[PDB]
């Protein structure tokens, strides 16, 4: 059964710290504890060890990432920016 209506994982905090703070933590803890696709072995086995460290349970691969996500939006822009600059130089 749906045990909580809206707090979700932040139900451990009870009634403390304010609803707005608990929603902000809810967004980033769902991201923090989610399993992600491995870009190497293709499985859904990538979990966060520590902030910025994302390790696949199989294939032993560890990738440097964001604090609470594997990849941040500014990082994907950088990767596309660096790819575009490298392609133009090698053109």
């Amino acid at each position: 059964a749906k045990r909580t209506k809206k707090v979700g994982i932040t139900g451990k905090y009870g009634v403390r710290y304010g609803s707005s703070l608990r929603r902000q933590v809810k967004k980033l803890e769902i991201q923090q504890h989610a399993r992600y696709d491995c870009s190497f072995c293709g499985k859904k086995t990538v979990k966060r060890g520590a902030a910025g460290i994302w390790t696949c349970s199989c294939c032993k691969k560890t990738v440097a990432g964001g604090a609470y996500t594997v990849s941040t939006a500014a990082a994907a822009t950088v990767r596309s920016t660096i790819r575009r600059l490298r392609e133009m130089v090698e053109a």
């Binding site: 870009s39 190497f40 072995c41 293709g42 499985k43």
Partner: protein
């Protein structure tokens, strides 16, 4: 184009999936074409390429990972390499891709 030719050989031909069966088929000379996923490890890719050079068999590079390759052969488990033992009514061998 490629995904329909892969679909037709699965429904009408002979094949095997996985690394240990592809290497065994290459070693026995029974393979006509092997398809390798994009996210296949380069050590495995260079080793499957090297057996196929000895076997003198064509290698197709699947644009898509093992998840897309497994889906493209009608399966719902990840498939890293597919070897075509013999095509059925598919023209995957005759077509240049």
């Amino acid at each position: 184009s490629i995904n329909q030719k892969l679909a037709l050989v699965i429904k009408s031909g002979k094949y095997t999936l996985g690394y240990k069966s592809t290497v065994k088929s290459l070693r026995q000379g029974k393979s006509k074409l092997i398809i390798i996923a994009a996210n296949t490890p380069v050590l495995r890719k260079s080793e499957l390429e090297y057996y196929a050079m000895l076997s003198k068999t064509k290698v197709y590079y699947f644009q898509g990972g093992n998840n897309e390759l497994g889906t493209a052969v009608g399966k719902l488990f990840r498939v890293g390499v597919v070897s075509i033992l013999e095509a059925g009514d598919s023209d995957i061998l005759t077509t240049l891709a």
